[PDB]
Amino acid sequence: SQKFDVIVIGAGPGGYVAAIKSAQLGLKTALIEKYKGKEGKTALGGTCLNVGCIPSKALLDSSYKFHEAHESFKLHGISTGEVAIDVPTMIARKDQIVRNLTGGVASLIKANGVTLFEGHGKLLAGKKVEVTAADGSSQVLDTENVILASGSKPVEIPPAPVDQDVIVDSTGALDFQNVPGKLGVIGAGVIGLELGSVWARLGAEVTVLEAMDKFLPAVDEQVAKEAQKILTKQGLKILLGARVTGTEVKNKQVTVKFVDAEGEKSQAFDKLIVAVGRRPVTTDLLAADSGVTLDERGFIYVDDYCATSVPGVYAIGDVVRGAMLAHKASEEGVVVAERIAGHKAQMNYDLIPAVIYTHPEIAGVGKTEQALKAEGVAINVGVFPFAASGRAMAANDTAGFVKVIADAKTDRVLGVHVIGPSAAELVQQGAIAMEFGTSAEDLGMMVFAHPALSEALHEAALAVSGHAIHVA
Amino acid sequence: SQKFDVIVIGAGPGGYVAAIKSAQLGLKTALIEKYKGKEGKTALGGTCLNVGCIPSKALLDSSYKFHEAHESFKLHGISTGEVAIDVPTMIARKDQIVRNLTGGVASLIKANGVTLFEGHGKLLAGKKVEVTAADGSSQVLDTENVILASGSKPVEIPPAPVDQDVIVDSTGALDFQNVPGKLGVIGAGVIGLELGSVWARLGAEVTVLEAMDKFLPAVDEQVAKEAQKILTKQGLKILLGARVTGTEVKNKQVTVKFVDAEGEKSQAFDKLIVAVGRRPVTTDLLAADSGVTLDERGFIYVDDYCATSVPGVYAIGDVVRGAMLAHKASEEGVVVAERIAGHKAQMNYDLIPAVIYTHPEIAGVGKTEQALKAEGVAINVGVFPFAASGRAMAANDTAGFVKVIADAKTDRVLGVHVIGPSAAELVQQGAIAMEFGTSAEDLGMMVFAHPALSEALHEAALAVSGHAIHVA
Ligand SMILES: Cc1cc2nc3c(=O)[nH]c(=O)nc-3n(C[C@H](O)[C@H](O)[C@H](O)COP(=O)(O)OP(=O)(O)OC[C@H]3O[C@@H](n4cnc5c(N)ncnc54)[C@H](O)[C@@H]3O)c2cc1C
Ligand SMILES: Cc1cc2nc3c(=O)[nH]c(=O)nc-3n(C[C@H](O)[C@H](O)[C@H](O)COP(=O)(O)OP(=O)(O)OC[C@H]3O[C@@H](n4cnc5c(N)ncnc54)[C@H](O)[C@@H]3O)c2cc1C
């Protein structure tokens, strides 16, 4: 109508979830989104669905299939001819997946009655929103509340400018049409290492340049050392304190200069991915505003209930503090929607799981052991290795471990971290119990189906107290 | 002779864990076991390690990889030759898995310091146990407590007796050296369809002949139905209501007659698996009278705590009442050792997960829906398909669903049931919520990572409450 209860600008996982939940709570909801995808029409779901979460998980699943037929089929007595990938077909499948899914979300807001404005939306004083359509149409809307879910973008570095051809960000990467001979990845983060894995399993030699002292500094210290080892055994070369000073591309490959034990220069990679960071988009989102503050780093100031400086305007997901993860932005969206309707809601930020979907998966919930040491919580810890799981052994999949950490005085579970088969699923079991204030004895006292990979969390909980059966 | 605090008869999953846990508690414990593994020596582990759990999953994983490369790799642009199999290698790999795990259990009891006696153990009157070594050397050992965990064996049927060549039970079906081109399975339960799925995938035209006309009674009906369709689509031809009348082992094949409303005989399979049930084993454990009562069906009579009629004697696993599962045996073992050393334990027989490790895998916990309706309880059901899941789509593993059954009055969760990818893990996350007293609304409020198969549980709980993001 001319009025709305809530207008959400940006339809990413925070944004379109914000929207469906606000409509489900009976508010007249609008949704503004400007992104048109790969088949010419607007494509909802954001970075995650279109150039993110679903694109990289899909290519990681296809490039794992390749690598199993290649390395271990023989251990199963399975013989194949020479196995070969068709990279246009693989990318076509992925694109068919983002097509299905884009479409799904679109039916979901129509069935749910949200009104979707296709254009750019910017917040005016008095919480009116001006929507500018492709041609330059301008339309302002009235609403009672605004929810800014504008998300983020690739950090951009001076020594290596992307041109979406020889040098690329995470989007260019996901759409290559052939495996590159040599691929450099700048940034050893979650995105860096996933994309690095994908093409190295298909055939690229891959070097992952990282400037920081440490490998994966936010993952538990024992889980990360184990991951460094295994990812390097599959030929990701991760050079850990490299600063790149410049790049040059004579016509079709890029020579990078960097400093790490020497002042070195890598023979001109055929592809370079730039995966140094993501950062918040505030591009034309606000007028000299409905007084919305930005912080020194570019994030929209919100409080702990994602409410800005302007009553009724909230900002959620990637433009705001916290982990830049899809489930953080979505739960920020439903929590926010509920505060606008049937108030009683706050998000627990101390229990959002983090997953990298590599060979094996790395995942963790709660606090890491090194963080527990900096504000001296005496911890007890139990660990159980998938080499000791008869289930993982049957699946020919024995790498990694489960790590359970507990309070040494009346052992409430403080962290569950794991690198292994199904890391996402077992950490979610760790997380569901943490939510009910579990101890390791609760976990240990439970009936876990056999054989199941789950048994290795049951056994890491038995082990906090030193009474695991299949190890000691 | 030597004098003990606990003597355990049988080293299957219940009894070898019972012996470890008594050792862990301070009791001089003795293990007795007479199974010789096909290699030569006494092999600990029982029906599950040697000839049940780990064998069937091991074959089930190689056959699905075969099944996958045949018709699945194409979808990712994987240009193979065309998938061939060497079954002699495929069983050799399972035989190593078993050798390594049997070896593992042996090193575990030794480390926990259990005395093993390789022989048959018979309980004599007045708590003393005799062990006969390989050659008739008798020994009577003294103890203040006894745990009989002797086991189960297959139900042999008169129309069709085993000879481990042409007519076989599940042990023999686990050791075939070639793929029968036509296979008959009598019994469409867990065992039956897992061994039929193994060889079907590898090429056997398989028929499952079932005496009841109710497919998978103890499994939630929505799920059993779904399961019957998806399994009939992979080529299992399951005939319900079929009784087999007679067997003609010729020299080539097994001609099997049967009546299924009409009396007919399906052609002459190359091999017949007799998979109708498993019965308890009590053979020579009674002296004349030990004092232990046997039950009318063959079991040993024990109370709710696995105590028999004879005060220092307990009986755990498949020789006793309950779902004949390895995790049920293990847990009763642990519980009996704890109340032996100081009564600090009790187990919940209402939350014991059960899984069929088929092609979608099938798991469930709590009450099935038909049982709830049958005893008049008011329920609300949230159901969520893997077809609408982000991760399943990327994995190309989209079949099936998650069903959360909660009580309509208190919103407490009654049963979790799922046919689909990682069913067993998703039910164990459900068993965990359920152990703590969850409402469907508690799980609906939790943060589940994106993308994840665990999210299909989240959205199922949210769907019990009418308000689930990605469907309705
Ligand atoms: C390669 C990669 C892999 C990732 N993998 C995962 C993963 O597996 N799991 C995970 O949790 N996270 C992952 N992430 C993070 C994840 O995708 C983001 O955290 C998530 O997308 C945050 O969503 P959002 O709603 O805040 O913003 P976004 O998804 O960025 O969506 C914001 C939307 O608002 C729109 N927009 C912006 N301004 C306007 C405007 N002014 N008017 C109209 N429309 C506008 C944009 O077009 C955009 O579509 C990944 C990210 C990448 C790049
Ligand atoms: C094909 C198949 C697949 C299965 N899959 C699964 C699965 O996936 N998950 C699951 O939970 N269950 C599974 N089961 C069942 C599992 O094998 C049993 O539930 C489990 O073995 C029962 O343990 P138990 O300790 O009671 O007995 P058992 O494992 O049978 O162990 C009994 C032991 O007692 C010993 N014994 C008997 N008499 C004496 C004697 N007098 N003296 C000394 N020793 C003796 C035997 O040699 C034997 O090793 C499967 C079974 C089959 C047949």
Curated annotation (Swiss-Prot), chains A, B:
GO biological process, one term: 2-oxoglutarate metabolic process
Entry-linked NCBIfam families: lipoamide_DH
Enzyme class: oxidoreductase
Catalytic reaction list: N(6)-[(R)-dihydrolipoyl]-L-lysyl-[protein] + NAD(+) = N(6)-[(R)-lipoyl]-L-lysyl-[protein] + NADH + H(+)
Cofactor note: Binds 1 FAD per subunit.
Name the record gives this protein: Dihydrolipoyl dehydrogenase
The protein's assembly and partners: Homodimer.
UniProt-listed Enzyme Commission number(s): 1.8.1.4
Ligand binding (NAD(+)): 187-191, 210, 244, 275-278
Keyword NAD in annotation: yes
Function: The pyruvate dehydrogenase complex catalyzes the overall conversion of pyruvate to acetyl-CoA and CO(2). It contains multiple copies of three enzymatic components: pyruvate dehydrogenase (E1), dihydrolipoamide acetyltransferase (E2) and lipoamide dehydrogenase (E3).
InterPro entries tied to this protein: Class-I_Pyr_Nuc-Dis_Oxidored (IPR050151), FAD/NAD-bd_sf (IPR036188), FAD/NAD-binding_dom (IPR023753), FAD/NAD-linked_Rdtase_dimer_sf (IPR016156), Lipoamide_DH (IPR006258), Pyr_nuc-diS_OxRdtase (IPR001100), Pyr_nucl-diS_OxRdtase_dimer (IPR004099), Pyr_OxRdtase_I_AS (IPR012999)
Cellular compartment(s): Cytoplasm
Misc remark: The active site is a redox-active disulfide bond.
Family under the similarity heading: Belongs to the class-I pyridine nucleotide-disulfide oxidoreductase family.
Disulfide linkage: 48-53
Residues reported in the UniProt entry to bind FAD: 33-48, 57, 121, 318, 326
Active site residues according to the UniProt entry: 450
GO MF entries: dihydrolipoyl dehydrogenase (NADH) activity; flavin adenine dinucleotide binding
One of the record's GO cellular component terms: cytoplasm
Co-factor(s): FAD
Keyword ATP-binding attached: no
Keywords, ordered alphabetically: Cytoplasm, Disulfide bond, FAD, Flavoprotein, NAD, Oxidoreductase, Redox-active center
One Pfam family recorded for the sequence: Pyr_redox_2
